[PDB]
Amino acid sequence: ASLVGELQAADAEYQNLANQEEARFNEERAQADAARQALAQNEQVYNELSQRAQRLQAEANTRFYKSQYQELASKYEDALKKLEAEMEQQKAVISDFEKIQALRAG
C-alpha cells in the first residue's frame, strides 16, 4: 500500500530511458553522417586508383618493365578490392541508419 512511490520510480526511469534512447539515436546518426563523408572520399580515390590500375595493366605488355608493371597493377588490384570492401561497410552504416530512422517513424 505505497503505490505513490512505485509511480515516481517509473517516471524517473521513463525520463532517463527517453534521454538514453534519444542520445543513442543521435550517436548512430553522427556515425552515419561521418560514413557519408568518408564514403565520398573513397568514392573519388577509388576512381583514380581504378583508373591508374587499368592504365598500368594496359601499357604493361609493351613496357620495357612489363613484369614490374604487371606486379604493381596487381598490387593496386588488391588494394582496390580492400577499399571496395570498406566502401561496402560504409554504405551499410548509412543505409542501416536510414532504415532505422525511417521505420522509427513511418
Side-chain angles (χ1 to χ4, degrees):
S2 178
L3 171 60
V4 186
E6 303 164 58
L7 277 179
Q8 292 177 311
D11 183 67
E13 289 174 51
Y14 175 91
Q15 299 294 169
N16 197 287
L17 187 60
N19 289 308
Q20 297 305 296
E21 175 65 32
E22 219 237 313
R24 174 77 132 90
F25 181 80
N26 289 155
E27 184 54 26
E28 216 63 49
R29 175 179 59 212
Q31 292 167 20
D33 288 331
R36 217 180 303 257
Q37 298 300 314
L39 171 60
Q41 235 77 80
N42 302 187
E43 218 81 301
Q44 59 160 289
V45 172
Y46 187 91
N47 262 31
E48 33 236 44
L49 270 46
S50 178
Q51 224 50 45
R52 189 174 286 188
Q54 288 178 297
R55 176 176 176 273
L56 284 173
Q57 193 61 69
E59 298 176 323
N61 216 277
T62 56
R63 286 317 81 171
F64 268 109
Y65 305 117
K66 163 184 287 196
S67 300
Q68 281 69 47
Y69 263 63
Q70 286 176 164
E71 173 188 293
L72 177 56
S74 186
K75 179 165 177 167
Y76 266 128
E77 186 48 53
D78 297 309
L80 224 48
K81 295 269 68 174
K82 289 197 197 69
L83 185 64
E84 200 185 307
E86 203 191 81
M87 271 161 34
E88 290 305 302
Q89 281 302 296
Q90 296 178 298
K91 304 184 177 190
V93 146
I94 284 171
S95 178
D96 277 32
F97 167 78
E98 299 209 308
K99 169 179 285 174
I100 286 179
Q101 198 205 193
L103 66 71
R104 268 166 106 282

